[PDB]
């Protein structure tokens with residue numbers, strides 16, 4: 059804009075370009091997101107504005123919402139790195155378990171907070187989990203999906219990833235629950251441990267079938283109501299469930315136990331963020347600092 063000197067393009071967001079910028083008047087450095095098209099839904103602005111009050115140490119702070127000139131800009135707290143990039147950079151040796159645990163623990167605290175205020179993310183992924191040199195990790199873009207919806211392609215035509223999508227969404231459920239975020243976080247947890255995406259689908263059916271091939275094709279015993287879902291087909295192949303010891307080796311039993319609860323098929327059975335914070339996996343949790351080269 060005019061009150062902000064663009065320092066650099068941080069990246070291409072799912073809704074528009076994102077710039078690192080300096081507030082010319084207060085000198086603060088922030089992240090500036092330009093969102094998408096003929097006027098901007100007034101319903102969206104009321105909803106987004108509401109998010110300015112959703113403040114927590116593990117949630118990227120929304121500093122301002124600007125509509126003027128009939129364009130939509132969101133100003134956010136700035137963090138130097140995202141988890142996707144950090145994982146790529148840690149691929150050779152992997153992120154130390156104490157750091158994975160600390161990150162998961164903080165992420166769950168952030169989810170527990172938003173969920174307690176009835177705000178869902180809906181599109182969690184490594185790219186929107188931001189980290190700093192102090193060992194903190196924060197969730198970015200909470201609540202935006204509800205306001206703008208999640209597109210197939212971003213403004214740049216890039217394909218939005220389906221890797222972290224909960225199965226109830228893939229099966230066509232119209233109503234999402236907080237459980238969809240726990241699923242996504244479980245997939246990210248598995249990816250930090252193994253250094254390979256858990257379910258890297260490249261289409262909705264491929265994503266769904268990758269889940270089925272690992273966790274078993276769901277049925278009425280494990281997921282009451284599943285055969286009645288909108289996109290469920292009796293013709294889906296029936297795959298047997300695999301053992302977790304084979305899915306996220308060499309994670310220990312506390313870790314495997316927690317992950318299994320975060321990946322339950324039935325959204326109602328899936329562990330809540332609050333209950334996950336009490337899981338024995340976090341008994342020895344600590345707050346290490348990452349080796350961050352900026």
Ligand SMILES: NC(=O)c1cc([N+](=O)[O-])c(N2CCOCC2)cc1NCc1cnc(N)nc1
Nearest residue numbers: 069070071076089134135136137138139140185
């Ligand atoms: N709020 C923020 O500070 C922030 C926002 C977004 N965003 O609004 O999307 C973002 N993206 C994540 C990857 O997709 C591109 C944009 C990254 C951010 N920060 C970490 C970071 C800073 N610089 C560089 N080069 N890479 C990462």
